[PDB]
Amino acid sequence: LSRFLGPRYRELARNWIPTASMWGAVGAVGLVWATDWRLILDWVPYINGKF
Amino acid sequence: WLEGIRKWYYNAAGFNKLGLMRDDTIYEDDDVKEAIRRLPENLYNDRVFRIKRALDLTMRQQILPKEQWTKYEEDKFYLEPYLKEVIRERKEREEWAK
Amino acid sequence: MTNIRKSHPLMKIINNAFIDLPAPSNISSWWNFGSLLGICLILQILTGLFLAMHYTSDTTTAFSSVTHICRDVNYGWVIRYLHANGASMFFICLFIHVGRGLYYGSYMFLETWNIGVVLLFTVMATAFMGYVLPWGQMSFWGATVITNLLSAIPYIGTDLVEWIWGGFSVDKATLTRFFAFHFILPFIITALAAVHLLFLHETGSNNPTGISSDMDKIPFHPYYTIKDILGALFMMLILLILVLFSPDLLGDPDNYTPANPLNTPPHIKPEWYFLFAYAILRSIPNKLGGVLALVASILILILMPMLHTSKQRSMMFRPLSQCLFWMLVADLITLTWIGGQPVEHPFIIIGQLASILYFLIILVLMPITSIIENNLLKW
Amino acid sequence: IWGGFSVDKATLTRFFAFHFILPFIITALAAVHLLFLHETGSNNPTGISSDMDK
Amino acid sequence: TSDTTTAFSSVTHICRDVNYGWVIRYLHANGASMFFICLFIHVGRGLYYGSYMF
Amino acid sequence: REFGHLTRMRHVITYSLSPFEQRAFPHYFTKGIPNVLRRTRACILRVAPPFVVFYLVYTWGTQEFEKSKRKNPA
Amino acid sequence: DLELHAPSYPWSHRGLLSSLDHTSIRRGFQVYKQVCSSCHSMDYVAYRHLVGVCYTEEEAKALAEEVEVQDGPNEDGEMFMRPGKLSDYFPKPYPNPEAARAANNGALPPDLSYIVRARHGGEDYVFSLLTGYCEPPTGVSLREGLYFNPYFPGQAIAMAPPIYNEVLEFDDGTPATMSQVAKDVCTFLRWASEPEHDHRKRMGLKMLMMMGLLLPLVYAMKRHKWSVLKSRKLAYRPP
Amino acid sequence: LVDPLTTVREQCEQIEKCIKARERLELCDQRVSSRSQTEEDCTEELFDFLHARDHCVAHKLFNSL
Amino acid sequence: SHTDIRVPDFSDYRRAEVLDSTKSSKESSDAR
Amino acid sequence: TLTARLYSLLFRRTSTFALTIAVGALFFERAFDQGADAIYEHINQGKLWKHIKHKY
Ligand code: HEC
Ligand code: HEM
Ligand code: HEM
Ligand code: HEM
């Protein structure tokens, strides 16, 4: 809504992008590991031995 | 004129048939709830009794007699100033928030 | 010293939820359905359990088990057709409940609304899986089509459908796991119904006028207990009329043929309460588009509290909104009929227009109309 | 209970249905049990009220 | 399944053919014993420390 | 939410009569029928038209269908 | 393409509370036994079911004993014929569906336990199918061995004319005209698909009378309890 | 042995609906037979005729049985 | 002002027997 | 009026009310079963097995 945007909320976004992006990376790696996603995991040195 | 369609819609809405004023049908959100809290005692009591009469009528599926209908020209907007002030204050708080 | 009704822990909950609950004194008959659904749920939990005591989920003996239920068990037919037509009545009451929510602006109770959407999804899932157990022609082929629907999901789709099937095609494993999921799910529905009631009771209820009835509440027990008993009696009248006079009125006759996977039935329509959804799927040419529209048809109920723009919670004081609501109901009926009919020249275009109109009314027509509503009322 | 004259085809399916339904009744009763226990609080090994050291 | 012509055969099917099905089967069979061990110890605890006052 | 903190009301008097002193069906037909007629008149111009349109669409679709299944002379 | 819709015949068991003509059921069973049972089956129906609906107990015993059914292994592990009893379902004309398909051209004669409840139309469809055979109209050439029946979807059935005139001899003495045979067999097949038909209608009658007695009374109770609120008169007395 | 169904049929084809049904049918037979290598068939003209005649017969017949 | 509080007439809804200044509420209580 | 006597006799006590309900259950069940069965056999006279068993 119009309550969002504005000056203040943009700095909040700036301070929370690092943590949110790293949480997204956490989720991506968790999905890859749990589902044993071949596509991503055929290029990581050690665990290529699974297949 | 446009008032013709406005009056037609006022009659078609049917809340006047229950002896209700326009602002009596307002959905009670947060700003509106604060608005009713802000109301003076006499207006609040009148509004409460009017709503009780409307609920009583709808329970029996009956409407007020023809003559006791809130005429479109006599629908005082008692809540409108208080609700406008509450919304303006909320807008001020939101603007200070950004 | 003290009343047990309001001092005993369990009795305190029962009192505050069914006895002394302040309910609006002007709620119309449309509010009875919340009771009936629950009662229907109980009935579905009940008769189905008695169906579980003579039904053996297996490909070579599921249909023979059902026909033995209806032909050799004492009064087996009563329980079986009670269950089928009670599921149909359950969906009738569910649709009427959602219609009441849409009309009288009950979606401002967001927690209860979303829990209701979850319950709706769970009930459609439960009924779909339940229709598979008889292992008839329509059972087998409808299950095949609806599960193949998930193949449209990108990347993981084929793996998903082969996981659901438990193999390569609808077969023994699918039947058994469908029976197990069919047993488990209604208890999840019951827990979600308890959560639904818990969320509702904190905000009271919505009377038809849409105004706060805090000045008019009446005790639940003396009045709405007998009101809901009368409503349940009416629903039992309808259900027993269906069971004892035209049992298979709302059913495909071809389901009384053992599932032969080598013969596609001329018609593969799902149950009557799914066609409104199914027609939507047949509207979009794209497969993934079809599945997405299928899911979104149900999911659009979540967006309603965000799409409400009129300053009046209810609809009884908004005539042009009533016209659009009844247009939407007529559109739903048209979608059901279209899903029933084959996908040919006079029906493809009608289904496309019906689906477009349904989405457009929910998303576009109603909010703009409510804006015009507020403008007309000088607020 | 046998659904006939001896434990047979009927009793097996009947027991299957009952074994399926019952644990959910057990869960409901367990919830009621936790409710009742919470209305008073747990009992410590010493057997004495421990409202001070909670 | 729940028919007497396919009960034992279906159990053996779960044990031998279903992928990791034997883990679930024996987990159930011995989790029943674990459940009852915990149940008996729970009743003994309630008896010993006078929790039956609740 | 229980009775006691529902709202604040003043100067409202309610008269009620015992259910054993009244008749459960007072003017059931004499007063009920005009009321039902008025209620039907109020809404019939807002609920009927869409269903009439649906019936027209139903009939048109059915006639178009089995007209399509008929021969085309050639 | 196109499809004949079977006209709604005025069956005796058509009214809301009209049971089945059990004499017609008795005759239809004989019609099935002597004509239809050569290539169809109702495996879900056993001779026991006939007791008390179309045949007496001793008659059902006699009917069952007229046929020979496979039994279990002997003390030597072989298969042996034995006369049937009131626990053996109606014998399957063909041991396996492949034999049935091979013998009757290449079509499987459907099992008729549910052939009325599985066909769109019910007794009307089957009656019209049996009494609807006709010479194909010009421009349609059926391959030898197929027979033109308009009501059958595709208008080309693999079915020899099942019932001609005076096929069998009804024990009652009723003339065995084709229409009578078809009516009786259709009623019998309706009983086969819905054995609870008579009791269903009976329970429906009791249900109707109970609701007609209860719904007014429960409505009266509702009015009784709510009449406090319906007659409630309010008043506003502000200072 | 005469079949009541046949008698009801013969007495029943005289309805004016079945009349024009038979005229359309016969027109179809001449049209199809005259055309040597055609594909059109008289199936649905026969279908209309049978629909009318069979609704008629369904009204009668069972009374005679 | 409390003396001006007069119950509105309920003769429209009142039940047959109890419709007069005669007592009609003790002897007819059992009937209703 | 008789209804007053009914109320004073069988209806005032809740437990006597329940006893009246219970005995009414017996007699109403029997009477209603007789009536409904008779009505059905009258409607479909000559078609039920009960009406045709005599000739076998
Ligand atoms: C000697 C063989 C034979 C006799 C006699 C026979 N049938 Fe059939 N019937 C068949 C075959 C073969 C089919 C398969 C036709 C097809 O599927 O195209 C068939 C098909 C049917 C169908 C299927 C209709 C449909 O479209 O679902 C019904 C119903 C039927 N028969 C009933 C009967 C009745 C009733 C009788 C006698 C009273 C009878 N039959 C006598 C061999 C027979
Ligand atoms: C959420 C409520 C339920 C719904 C909507 C539902 C729906 C259905 C439907 C539509 C059928 C198909 C009936 C038929 O085609 O003849 C069915 C079958 C079945 N249901 Fe349910 N059911 C419900 C609850 C239950 C429960 C709780 C059980 C287990 C206790 C159960 C057990 C069965 C069984 C065993 C069958 C197969 C027998 C049959 O087909 O009738 N159902 N269900
Ligand atoms: C499992 C099926 C369901 C059951 C058992 C159930 C149960 C109930 C009950 C008993 C009530 C109170 C009675 C009433 O107000 O009508 C209620 C209210 C409500 N339910 Fe449901 N419900 C179900 C499904 C749904 C669905 C699908 C929705 C919509 C998404 C929904 C949304 C609501 C809303 C909004 C209310 C408040 C109505 C009001 O007070 O105005 N429920 N529910
Ligand atoms: C279904 C199995 C059961 C579950 C899930 C269950 C659950 C629980 C839980 C979680 C507690 C709190 C933890 C504890 O104090 O041990 C508890 C307490 C208790 N349970 Fe159970 N219980 C079960 C069976 C039983 C049985 C069989 C009895 C004895 C008849 C019993 C009597 C008690 C008592 C007396 C307490 C309070 C203990 C204390 O205050 O010291 N429970 N129950």
TrEMBL record, chain A:
Pfam families the record matches: UCR_6-4kD
Compartment annotation: Mitochondrion inner membrane
Recorded GO CC terms: mitochondrial inner membrane; respiratory chain complex III
GO biological process, one term: mitochondrial electron transport, ubiquinol to cytochrome c
Keyword Electron transport attached: yes
Keywords: Electron transport, Membrane, Mitochondrion, Mitochondrion inner membrane, Respiratory chain, Transmembrane, Transmembrane helix, Transport
InterPro entries reported in the protein's UniProt record: Single_a-helix_sf, UQCR
Membrane topology: Single-pass membrane protein
Residue spans crossing the bilayer: 20-40
Chief place where the protein resides: mitochondrion
Superkingdom, natural source: Eukaryota
Gene3D superfamilies associated with the record: 1.20.5.220
Family of this protein: Belongs to the UQCR11/QCR10 family.
Subunit relationships: Component of the ubiquinol-cytochrome c oxidoreductase (cytochrome b-c1 complex, complex III, CIII), a multisubunit enzyme composed of 11 subunits. The complex is composed of 3 respiratory subunits cytochrome b, cytochrome c1 and Rieske protein UQCRFS1, 2 core protein subunits UQCRC1/QCR1 and UQCRC2/QCR2, and 6 low-molecular weight protein subunits UQCRH/QCR6, UQCRB/QCR7, UQCRQ/QCR8, UQCR10/QCR9, UQCR11/QCR10 and subunit 9, the cleavage product of Rieske protein UQCRFS1.
Protein name: Cytochrome b-c1 complex subunit 10
Species assigned in the record: Sus scrofa (Pig)
Gene: UQCR11
UniProtKB/TrEMBL annotation, chain B:
Primary location group: mitochondrion
GO cellular component: mitochondrial inner membrane; respiratory chain complex III
Subcellular location: Mitochondrion inner membrane
Alphabetized UniProt keyword annotations: Electron transport, Membrane, Mitochondrion, Mitochondrion inner membrane, Respiratory chain, Transport
InterPro entries in alphabetical order: QCR7 (IPR003197), QCR7_sf (IPR036544)
Record Gene3D superfamilies: Cytochrome b-c1 complex subunit 7
Pfam families: UCR_14kD
Its membrane topology: Peripheral membrane protein
Residue ranges of coiled coil: none
GO biological process: mitochondrial electron transport, ubiquinol to cytochrome c
Role description: Component of the ubiquinol-cytochrome c oxidoreductase, a multisubunit transmembrane complex that is part of the mitochondrial electron transport chain which drives oxidative phosphorylation.
Record note on quaternary structure: Component of the ubiquinol-cytochrome c oxidoreductase (cytochrome b-c1 complex, complex III, CIII), a multisubunit enzyme composed of 11 subunits. The complex is composed of 3 respiratory subunits cytochrome b, cytochrome c1 and Rieske protein UQCRFS1, 2 core protein subunits UQCRC1/QCR1 and UQCRC2/QCR2, and 6 low-molecular weight protein subunits UQCRH/QCR6, UQCRB/QCR7, UQCRQ/QCR8, UQCR10/QCR9, UQCR11/QCR10 and subunit 9, the cleavage product of Rieske protein UQCRFS1.
Family statement drawn from the similarity comment of this UniProt entry: Belongs to the UQCRB/QCR7 family.
Protein name: Cytochrome b-c1 complex subunit 7
UniProtKB/TrEMBL annotation, chain D:
Binding site for heme b b566: H33
Binding positions for heme b 1 per the UniProt entry: H33, S42, N43
Chain sites annotated for binding heme b 2: N43
Listed transmembrane segments: 15-37
Residues annotated as binding a ubiquinone: H38
Physiological role: Component of the ubiquinol-cytochrome c reductase complex (complex III or cytochrome b-c1 complex) that is part of the mitochondrial respiratory chain. The b-c1 complex mediates electron transfer from ubiquinol to cytochrome c. Contributes to the generation of a proton gradient across the mitochondrial membrane that is then used for ATP synthesis.
Family: Belongs to the cytochrome b family.
Subcellular location, record wording: Mitochondrion inner membrane
UniProt feature coiled coil, ranges: none
Binding site for ubiquinone-10: H38
Positions annotated to bind heme b b562: H19
Name of this chain's protein: Cytochrome b
Binding site for heme b 3: H19
Gene this protein is translated from: cytb
Tree of life domain: Eukaryota
Residues that bind heme b 4: H19
Subunit annotation: The cytochrome bc1 complex contains 11 subunits: 3 respiratory subunits (MT-CYB, CYC1 and UQCRFS1), 2 core proteins (UQCRC1 and UQCRC2) and 6 low-molecular weight proteins (UQCRH/QCR6, UQCRB/QCR7, UQCRQ/QCR8, UQCR10/QCR9, UQCR11/QCR10 and a cleavage product of UQCRFS1). This cytochrome bc1 complex then forms a dimer.
UniProtKB/TrEMBL annotation, chain J:
SUPFAM superfamilies xrefs: Subunit X (non-heme 7 kDa protein) of cytochrome bc1 complex (Ubiquinol-cytochrome c reductase) (SSF81514)
Pfam families, sorted: UCR_UQCRX_QCR9
Membrane topology (UniProt): Single-pass membrane protein
Location of the protein in the cell: Mitochondrion inner membrane
GO BP: mitochondrial electron transport, ubiquinol to cytochrome c
A GO CC term assigned to this protein in UniProt: respiratory chain complex III
Cross-referenced Gene3D superfamilies: Cytochrome b-c1 complex subunit 9
Keywords: Electron transport, Membrane, Mitochondrion, Mitochondrion inner membrane, Respiratory chain, Transmembrane, Transmembrane helix, Transport
Function in brief: Component of the ubiquinol-cytochrome c oxidoreductase, a multisubunit transmembrane complex that is part of the mitochondrial electron transport chain which drives oxidative phosphorylation. The complex plays an important role in the uptake of multiple carbon sources present in different host niches.
Similarity remark: Belongs to the UQCR10/QCR9 family.
Subunit relationships: Component of the ubiquinol-cytochrome c oxidoreductase (cytochrome b-c1 complex, complex III, CIII), a multisubunit enzyme composed of 11 subunits. The complex is composed of 3 respiratory subunits cytochrome b, cytochrome c1 and Rieske protein UQCRFS1, 2 core protein subunits UQCRC1/QCR1 and UQCRC2/QCR2, and 6 low-molecular weight protein subunits UQCRH/QCR6, UQCRB/QCR7, UQCRQ/QCR8, UQCR10/QCR9, UQCR11/QCR10 and subunit 9, the cleavage product of Rieske protein UQCRFS1.
